[PDB]
Amino acid sequence: GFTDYIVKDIALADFGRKEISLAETEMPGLMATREEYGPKQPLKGARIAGSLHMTIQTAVLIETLAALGADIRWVSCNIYSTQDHAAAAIAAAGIPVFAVKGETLTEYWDYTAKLFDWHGGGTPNMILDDGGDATMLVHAGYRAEQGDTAFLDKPGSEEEEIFYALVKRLLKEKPKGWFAEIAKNIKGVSEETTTGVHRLYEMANKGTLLFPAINVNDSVTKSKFDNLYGCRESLVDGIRRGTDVMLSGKVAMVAGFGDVGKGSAASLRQAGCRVMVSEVDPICALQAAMEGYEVVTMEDAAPRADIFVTATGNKDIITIEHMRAMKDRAIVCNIGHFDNEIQIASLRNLKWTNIKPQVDEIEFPDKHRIIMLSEGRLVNLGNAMGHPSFVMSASFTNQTLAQIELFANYAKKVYVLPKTLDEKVARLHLAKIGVKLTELRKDQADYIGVKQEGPYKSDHYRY
Amino acid sequence: GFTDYIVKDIALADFGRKEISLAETEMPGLMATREEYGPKQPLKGARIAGSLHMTIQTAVLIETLAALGADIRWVSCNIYSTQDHAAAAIAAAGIPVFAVKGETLTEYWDYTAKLFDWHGGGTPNMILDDGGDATMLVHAGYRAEQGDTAFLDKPGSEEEEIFYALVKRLLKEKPKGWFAEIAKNIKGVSEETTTGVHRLYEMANKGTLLFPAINVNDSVTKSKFDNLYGCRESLVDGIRRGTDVMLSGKVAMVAGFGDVGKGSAASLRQAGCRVMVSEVDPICALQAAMEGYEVVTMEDAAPRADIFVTATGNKDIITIEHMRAMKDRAIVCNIGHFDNEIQIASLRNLKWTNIKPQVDEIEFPDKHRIIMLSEGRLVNLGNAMGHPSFVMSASFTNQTLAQIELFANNKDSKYAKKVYVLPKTLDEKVARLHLAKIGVKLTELRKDQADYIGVKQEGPYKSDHYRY
Amino acid sequence: GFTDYIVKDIALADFGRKEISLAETEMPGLMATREEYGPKQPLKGARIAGSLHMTIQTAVLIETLAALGADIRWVSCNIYSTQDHAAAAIAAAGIPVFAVKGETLTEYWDYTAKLFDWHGGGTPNMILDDGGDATMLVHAGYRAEQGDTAFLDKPGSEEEEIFYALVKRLLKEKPKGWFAEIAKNIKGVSEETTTGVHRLYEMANKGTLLFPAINVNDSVTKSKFDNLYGCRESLVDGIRRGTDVMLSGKVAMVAGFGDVGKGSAASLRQAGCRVMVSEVDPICALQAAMEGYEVVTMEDAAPRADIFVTATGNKDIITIEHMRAMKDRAIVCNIGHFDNEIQIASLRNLKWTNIKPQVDEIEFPDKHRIIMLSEGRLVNLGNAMGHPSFVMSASFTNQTLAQIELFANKYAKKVYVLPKTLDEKVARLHLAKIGVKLTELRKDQADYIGVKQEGPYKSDHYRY
Amino acid sequence: GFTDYIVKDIALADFGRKEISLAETEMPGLMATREEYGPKQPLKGARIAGSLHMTIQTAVLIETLAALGADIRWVSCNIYSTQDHAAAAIAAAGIPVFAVKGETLTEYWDYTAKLFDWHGGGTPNMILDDGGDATMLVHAGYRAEQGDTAFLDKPGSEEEEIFYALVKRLLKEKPKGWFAEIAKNIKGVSEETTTGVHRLYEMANKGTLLFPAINVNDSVTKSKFDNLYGCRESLVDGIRRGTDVMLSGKVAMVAGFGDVGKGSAASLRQAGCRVMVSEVDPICALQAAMEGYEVVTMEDAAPRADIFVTATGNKDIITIEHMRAMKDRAIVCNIGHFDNEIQIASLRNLKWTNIKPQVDEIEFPDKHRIIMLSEGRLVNLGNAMGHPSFVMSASFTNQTLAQIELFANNKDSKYAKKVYVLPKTLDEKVARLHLAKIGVKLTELRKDQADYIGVKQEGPYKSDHYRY
């Protein structure tokens, strides 16, 4: 009998195995990676603590890691993003997973802690992270442990106080110097996403980052496919499943026109919305305008749009006074980060009426309502199924190569994968979708000053 | 004390009511119709038997009819299109409904018959039909009642055998002349969809149509919105929910480029597929080409597309030989009619592996597999939630007007036993009811400009011939 | 030894012939019509007076008609739409053609009259028309001719004054009963466009239409291809050649969301504009909103848009008061009809500065300026080359069949459209060139949906 | 009588002046730079040699440079790209320009020579280059100079034996050592385009770069706007004007899916073509596939496509083998560089029939034909008017600021003989200068938000490695 998991319903494993099988066919990067490195066992001896959305696509990553030799513990990095049948399938395969769709904030953090008590004793020795929560627990616990503890009493939001409480409990409960023990053994962290990657650079900049980091996010085959086309597919999926609204004839507002805002704007415009965009970056604003989006402030958009999406990575994008101005039954959601793009906390003393999981109606004192999706957390993973498998194969092939890099083939800074590996990720996905790549003849290669086998662009190229 | 319904779980009534409320906001035509005709109760005394997908949108239509005075009994017109919280909410309102997502074919036809056993006794006096099943139940039983029973005594499909078995049962279990009783009481039928309306015209053409009919499908504000923009939103919704597959990068094939096929190809193109189309009609073919779609035969597309959608209203579109030639894990689905656009019957010797409701993996002798959605029945309603509310407001406002026309505006017998469409002024009225909700500001003709183009300021703005 | 033509530069004939050759490859339907009916000579004995934009595409139509046996005289139906090399090539082939890019309204009407003095004597016996001007001349002279002359003293625009002056002239120069003679000789008219078909239906409904007519515009394979895709390709072509502005990032306003408005909005949207639309028709307005266009009034748009396009066929769409509100150097143009969708007349006392042909900058007293294309006439024909040949093959195959119907093939003095099987046939004639492979119904399947295997496939009310 | 210009016609100056005035309104970035820097005269003493298409847009740049203090000499960097009326207006402004649409290759290089004889003797001190021709002139002459000359006697193309026999003539005709004189006085070069800049990078890498250089092509507000959106607007413009062909229904083939190829595919797809794409870079191939383009080889496309566009910057993309396999009257054109993307030389003995300027019909032994635009040279500038003004305003505001950096802000010598880019804050400023004209309203970061994402409120908002 296996005891060391927490999932909604183990019986869901066969359903999860079915969808994993279908996903494998859609993830050639991952499957080709298994066949290349399976034989070579480059992660043999890895103990990978994984904190990343426990979806069907992540199950395929997990078993890739396990096929490369890795020993695994896993949690979701979001309280609503777990796909319970994926988690059930992993648990039934003997991998400790602690992931429930709709976990509480306290459970979310307790489970993250569980990643570091390895089965058979000891710590992890690699972190695979999305949004940086597992890395942040290690760093906060290490800093409290070095003696700097007043910060844990700093008042904050609810989640922030749960986190401080968790660090206090681990310090009270684990042996002296537990966090230093973990920090010592972690050989590297690979980070999936823009927000978490920004945290890593700020810590590398303060000299406060405890082990090397590979920025998986800014592989070109991650940032310009997952963040862009992922969201182009999965944002409108989230909105439709949450609300079933007609998008043709609607006005949508997207805050942010980075990779996620571009894909989000595109998702809504392809689905038939007339899209407006806000930006603080004049180059990205000019991109939006050249794509035919009206570029406006949120104050301008607030009374006009039918649908609002935050896509910034920033905080306080849609505020109480915007929502006060919205039309009755405007739809509001977040595809960027955490839950602070929208001022969710300032809504908690209005009447919330739950419609169904991750769909709520919020009523203002003047009787106008808004429809809030996933309580302001990632809408594509919360209200639907996240990005489809194929584009996740790109991102997760990057993740697997990043773990191989950090556990085998780096100083205490933040690195990207070499461009020939990035190009390799692309190559692995072309045959599945029928691309026939041309090859430079040698004189054509020489003419533009590249090798026939690449890299084809300088490190500065932006695609 | 109410037990005259059959639904999956009456406990989903509260969830259903919440989505119904959300849908009212998205259905201005239906709600304005309640406001305008509510106080006039134009449907008082009406007994409307509805056979139309039991969705949240249909629930708003049903409550609009009752707001106008109608007594109602309802069933879904597909075994997989019921939205069980919508059914629950209607049954909890006291309205007889017999609608379950995943009902069997035998259950399906028995529920249709239950439409005609009015509560308190008697029959309906109106039919609101989608796809013509309730209308066909009356006409077939009437024909058999007349002594022309030959056709029952062997069918052609399984459903044709269940269906004829029903007719036989009703001839024995219902009183003598019951189908003539019904046909006598029915004052009209309004019919929702292309396939069902074609049946009506053929029956009218042969002089077998037993009561006046309004073709709601071919209102402009139905066929060029519902069939076109409805499918554009709901086709990939259903493919996404069933498979979670990445559409960008994939080749899709759509059979048909009528209104549904146009909306279905846009759905897949707008989602990022490279879309090819088949057609038999040279005009529709050339439209597909001019919109940038490659126009090929199914035989051409069979070995190369990732996704197949039938959208023809015809049969035998995707055959066993096509599916044999398909790449492994190709997705096959139908958004047109019945379940014989795809030869589903030809697959029933193969290993089916159920993935989840309405998603099956079918494995061929050569180990090649295909992914079948909703067993070949309407994918948008079976795998997702059908069209969204706002465009169904247009369809269903037309339905309501048509019900008013045949029930309350036929004292002079303006509607004979033929198939009619609503007048243009009503069709424009449907459009006008939906403009303010989406922020459209309409221009008003100046008097001079109105005279200049030969129209009244209040419309109608186009000849009856105009194709939009 | 011909001089029965008027063209700007007959030395452009070789160049027109080269582009005619190129267009023939692009016009499968016209060419297959030549091939199929040529040996039938169904137009032998026809004398076709054509009034239709003298473009390269129209040259291929004219030579198709001649190849089916027609005798021909031709003019352009718009003063800026002639392509001078196409006119030179038709003149050089020996066919009377009176068409110059930039002809004046006075010349325009003098040339239309030249249609009716048939070479070798007599009158024409068919009319192929676009916008109805040749038809209108016959009807006006015929009405005045039998006595009601008073309307000729009441012109309501300067073009009407020129047209009425022409009628007076003819009635005095030409033999008595001349218009009654023409009217008797005309066996039919086929009419290209929405506006001209508007004119026929109202003459028919009033019982003043003098001969039978075929509404070619409302072939499916015309209105839902030419009016729609044609404008989609050629509206932005005209705006780019006249202004060379960047379209990405600009706001455009299209008045009307009929077929032309639909195509025009798509032209500007596809080019990169954020497009707003006006409509009086709630159904067309709802279509626009559902295709993602903001549907506003002209008054809402006037201070906002960078580009304005009238596509209504109505009058007084863009007024002096709208133009006074426009931002400086807004671009204004018409793709609908005549020049009364924009109040061009009202700008006649502002300072006009010609930039180049069909491009003018108009200064208001407050010094704000607007860019006017083609003096508010058809911008795709005025500033560029009209629709491209392939879509025009569809319209002109319909023209050619309508000429055959009325001349060789029952037709009362009403307005008729071609039978659906001919409409389908037009579409078939264009599939192989663009690589379409049509599916053939099995008898099985045809029987199931209620059609003959060979069509037609749709009821006559089907809207496509 | 100022005598020093070579144009097609001086009498076109007024028409050029009318369109320059129109273009200023469309070029808020250049005008803003004029107003802000005019008073500061940051380029008094500058003597800029410019080699860059003599278009209406270039004329506004030239006058901008002139307004900031510059003495100027100009040539076009393509034989067909000159807009004769712009040239005439510049000449009439008193500026030495030598540019004719349809100049010879021998005149082109002799004009490029006329650049370095500064009026009143002496040399330029600034090079503003598109393609690096005037740059390589200095460099190929300088190398020639103190030693190596064996490369001059080794041709390549016809435009390379002409280029070498020109280098021969200056060595001969100028004072001995004059190429060193020029490389001496040149404070810097700014380079407009991808092909030019890589040649700068190949040379700074070799240690043979003779003066500082700003890579203007890789400000974000050039490469991601001009290369992309410029070709999206002007590719189909060139093709329409050259051929008047219907694009809806046609298949187009685009070699390359860098910035120009992305722009080019979009231009054709938005105009109604079904677009196929070739690539050698697996990442750009994957981007095309994800945008819905079929990605194939040129051998696959050659018999299929109606329209071919080269967009690679590389040579031998379309060879005699491909063109032999094309369908009759296929359209072939190039928007990348030079005229060696298409093997034009392989057509040199076939029948060419000139349709009109920059449009030729080429007939093969088998009587099949292709239509070649601008003889294989840049189709958007040869057959139409190049990129529109608004997007050249972004490129040319970068050019202007690059000329200010190398001439005015190099006193500390912060620019050595390497290839630099402008600072991101200046790149951001170019973008800001174009927002108000197109009605963009920018949001302002509050300080806590700026801290949160790790940026100053005033920018730069992205890291130097960010890809947009």
Ligand SMILES: NC(=O)c1ccc[n+]([C@@H]2O[C@H](COP(=O)([O-])OP(=O)(O)OC[C@H]3O[C@@H](n4cnc5c(N)ncnc54)[C@H](O)[C@@H]3O)[C@@H](O)[C@H]2O)c1
């Ligand atoms: N839901 C998903 O599946 C998914 C996928 C990828 C990335 N992400 C997340 O999305 C967020 C954004 O990622 P990205 O890759 O687009 O980052 P990015 O840096 O590429 O883009 C962020 C944009 O936000 C803009 N911005 C910042 N503050 C703004 C404000 N107040 N108003 C308007 N715009 C503002 C910035 O100018 C920037 O251009 C992050 O939280 C990231 O981790 C989510």
Ligand SMILES: NC(=O)c1ccc[n+]([C@@H]2O[C@H](COP(=O)([O-])OP(=O)(O)OC[C@H]3O[C@@H](n4cnc5c(N)ncnc54)[C@H](O)[C@@H]3O)[C@@H](O)[C@H]2O)c1
């Ligand atoms: N799923 C939905 O929500 C929804 C919505 C509206 C209508 N419908 C149904 O969808 C079907 C189609 O409706 P429509 O309004 O588009 O009708 P239509 O008459 O407008 O279009 C059907 C098209 O299929 C083409 N066709 C017929 N046989 C073909 C074949 N063997 N191969 C390829 N093409 C063929 C026809 O030429 C025709 O253009 C009908 O059964 C209708 O009832 C479904």
Ligand SMILES: NC(=O)c1ccc[n+]([C@@H]2O[C@H](COP(=O)([O-])OP(=O)(O)OC[C@H]3O[C@@H](n4cnc5c(N)ncnc54)[C@H](O)[C@@H]3O)[C@@H](O)[C@H]2O)c1
């Ligand atoms: N330039 C071309 O090549 C070209 C091609 C085809 C037709 N046309 C012409 O274009 C005009 C329109 O043709 P159509 O086929 O689209 O006709 P249509 O009947 O299909 O469309 C006209 C539309 O204008 C709308 N309208 C009328 N007055 C309006 C107003 N004041 N404000 C806003 N909308 C108004 C109508 O409601 C209608 O939908 C006609 O003059 C026709 O002859 C030109």
Ligand SMILES: NC(=O)c1ccc[n+]([C@@H]2O[C@H](COP(=O)([O-])OP(=O)(O)OC[C@H]3O[C@@H](n4cnc5c(N)ncnc54)[C@H](O)[C@@H]3O)[C@@H](O)[C@H]2O)c1
């Ligand atoms: N006409 C214009 O207005 C204009 C504007 C900007 C740039 N350009 C020119 O266009 C060319 C391309 O510029 P860019 O910015 O796109 O550079 P880029 O580096 O961004 O893109 C070029 C692409 O071509 C691909 N490639 C190279 N050889 C190939 C082959 N044999 N087959 C298929 N793909 C191949 C490369 O992989 C690369 O992705 C350059 O010559 C540049 O100077 C022209």
Ligand code: NA
């Ligand atoms: Na997914």
Ligand code: NA
């Ligand atoms: Na729905």
Ligand code: NA
């Ligand atoms: Na043309």
Ligand code: NA
């Ligand atoms: Na230009």
